[PDB]
């Protein structure tokens, strides 16, 4: 549950900022008091969760993130927001 | 003093709006 969180912290900062929000700030803390190492997260429209990592994988986490990101589109599109990208960003 | 797996730690899990609500 350490190393899984190591890699995520890179993909939050080592990754590209275009495909992130502007106010995205990722951190890292050593909490000896916790039961297990965790990945707490906060989304745009109010959603908030925690995922402990002493048992899971990096793949089981991503489908949870899709289970949120797929819905926020269904929430923000109804508000009128175009959260989509231009077609010219990546070709095959 | 060493790694023992916890027992009762699970947080709340966010509930999404239902189509009736929406």
């Amino acid at each position: 549950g350490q190393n899984i969180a190591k890699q995520i912290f890179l993909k939050c900062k080592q990754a590209r900022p275009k495909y992130l929000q502007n106010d995205f700030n990722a951190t890292l803390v050593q909490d000896n008091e916790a039961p297990a190492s965790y990945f707490h997260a906060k989304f745009v429209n109010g959603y908030e969760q925690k995922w402990y990592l002493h048992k899971s994988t990096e793949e089981e986490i991503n489908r949870n993130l899709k289970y949120f990101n797929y819905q926020i589109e269904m929430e923000r599109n109804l508000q009128g927001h175009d959260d989509e990208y231009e077609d010219e960003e990546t070709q095959l | 003093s060493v790694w023992k797996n916890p027992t009762n730690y699970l947080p709340e899990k966010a509930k999404f709006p239902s189509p009736k609500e929406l």
Partner: protein
């Protein structure tokens, strides 16, 4: 010399390289180590308890080793050890208890 041979088992059998957090608890492994030490410290004539208290203050000032846990050069209270060895040595110590012995009431 039968003690050195017996001792090297118990440190091996309690080599558990799991990372730890210094707490009240201890492993059952570590207790086999502690319990073997007490079995050797109880069965010793009083001429020997005298000696062991003299050994330590020859071994603690040497302090070959750094750690915030174990013996340490930067451990503050080492310098006094040269002066006082036993509280029975200080004759002032002999005043305190008889003085305190009458202060209980």
């Amino acid at each position: 010399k039968x003690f050195e041979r017996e001792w090297q088992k118990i440190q091996r059998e309690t080599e558990d390289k799991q990372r730890q957090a210094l707490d009240a608890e201890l492993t059952p492994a570590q207790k086999k180590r502690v319990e073997f030490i007490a079995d050797a410290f109880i069965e010793l004539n009083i001429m020997e308890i005298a000696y062991l208290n003299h050994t330590l203050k020859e071994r603690l000032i040497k302090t070959t080793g750094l750690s915030p846990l174990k013996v340490n050069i930067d451990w503050p209270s080492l310098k006094q050890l040269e002066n006082g060895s036993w509280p029975p040595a200080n004759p002032n110590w002999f005043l305190q208890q008889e003085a305190i012995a009458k202060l209980w009431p």
